[PDB]
Ligand SMILES: COc1ccc(-c2nnn(CCN)n2)cc1
Ligand SMILES: [Yb+3]
Ligand SMILES: [Yb+3]
């Protein structure tokens with residue numbers, strides 16, 4: 001049972017295809033059109049079905065060229081409103097029909113962000129982007145909004161002629177709109193069945209540059225050059241991922257670099273990964289996000305979680321594959337460094353929620369929980385830790401990668417649960433069941449807190465980070481003179497980030513220590529978003545008033561939730577900046593991404 005959906009489940013009926021014909025109106029901030037759903041009955045004598053909707057205006061429902069009766073139920077908070085459709089003729093098992101729904105979105109759709117020209121790089125044209133994961137596809141179009149149903153899709157999108165539309169699909173041409181010469185129609189085809197959270201749309205003043213045989217980078221003109229360089233390793237990563245997961249089935253692998261309010265680091269939209277512009281560090285150091293998004297082309301997009309309670313299947317296996325890609329490119333010591341860093345992020349998430357919090361369980365129960373509120377590093381890192389522990393228990397990376405490839409092959413184009421995964425793990429490792437039976441499954445899968453066992457990690461690249469962090473933590477006023485810019489000479493950007501992560505775990509540090517750190521290391525000059533974020537959190541938690549305008553600027557100039565949420569929270573927790581944090585949120589709220597605005601509001605206790 002998918003407890004996040006109000007629609008008829010997959011056991012009743014299944015959407016096989018969506019044909020979307022829509023028009024984008026920037027003056028009204030609406031998407032208007034028709035969603036033609038090809039539905040297959042799974043039951044005898046089926047006479048009605050229910051779809052998910054959220055803030056949608058429905059004009060009519062057409063089946064067999066005639067209008068049919070439908071009713072929208074009372075709204076169920078974040079789940080939206082169920083839409084019951086009365087079928088004109090009872091359907092037998094396996095019978096298929098086409099249901100054409102004429103709809104319009106609300107300007108406040110939780111799936112969309114409408115940007116004014118002032119919010120874009122070019123300053124001349126507006127911009128629109130979607131973000132359906134987890135349950136926001138229902139805020140764009142009526143659908144069975146559950147990852148347990150997979151469908152193909154075709155779409156025709158009408159937009160003002162000066163703008164470009166892209167979707168999570170293969171581009172199928174453009175023409176002037178035959179109904180309006182001031183507009184263009186962009187066509188799309190997604191021939192591989194996908195869960196509806198993978199439907200995505202962007203409309204804006206977009207330009208492209210080729211960076212690989214199957215990859216274009218898309219962004220506004222101002223970011224194209226920097227993006228092509230930042231993501232130049234994409235093809236090399238795709239070749240490694242194919243070797244690990246089997247064929248890349250999606251055709252194209254394009255990248256879209258969104259405006260700064262994009263709420264996540266990346267979104268694995270098929271054929272067109274969406275990325276935050278905060279990855280544009282200038283040195284490719286944040287490329288693991290591309291490796292992660294590429295990996296989802298197997299773990300998440302091909303093999304999908306049946307319900308959001310099993311989201312760790314998507315994230316845990318993706319982080320596992322991402323870390324193998326980075327390990328192939330940079331070495332096994334680097335894979336262990338990143339894996340150990342991940343354990344640290346898990347420690348942080350567990351400490352933030354509390355060790356008994358239900359959101360720290362690997363398999364969660366999302367009954368009456370908004371998925372956006374439960375979202376965290378837990379499914380990524382606790383999921384990764386489980387797989388890394390199993391890799392060590394089962395004979396190493398080569399052996400465990402054999403399982404990963406077989407798992408992807410077994411469940412391709414399907415939606416599965418934790419029980420399906422565990423059953424297959426036991427089947428594949430039938431000769432190692434004695435070892436598998438030693439795993440504390442109840443603790444790993446269903447208990448809150450840190451996992452019961454911590455994997456073994458090579459420390460080579462981590463040692464220098466820990467040693468420098470410990471020197472600062474144990475330093476007294478008379479030791480401050482010993483620190484110098486030379487302390488960092490042999491540290492990579494990754495190691496500088498880990499040094500800050502280690503130090504931040506012990507924050508606050510004395511104000512004089514943080515002032516000395518700026519004096520000798522000049523961290524204020526670093527633009528790398530990950531390093532800058534950790535440095536500013538360290539400054540604010542250590543009560544440095546000079547950091548207040550820097551932290552407020554980072555929190556608002558970009559909108560990646562990983563950065564924006566903890567920055568606003570740290571600023572609200574610092575007495576000197578509390579009022580400024582609340583006022584800044586109130587002033588920016590109306591122009592923020594709808595999900596980010598909701599979450600920052602909840603974090604700040606501002607309604
Ligand atoms: C289970 O609840 C949730 C809520 C939000 C998300 C989400 N949106 N974007 N991302 C990053 C790309 N996969 N994740 C996922 C799951
Ligand atoms: Yb074609
Ligand atoms: Yb001393």
Ligand SMILES: [Zn+2]
Pocket residue numbers: 292296314315318
């Ligand atoms: Zn992911």
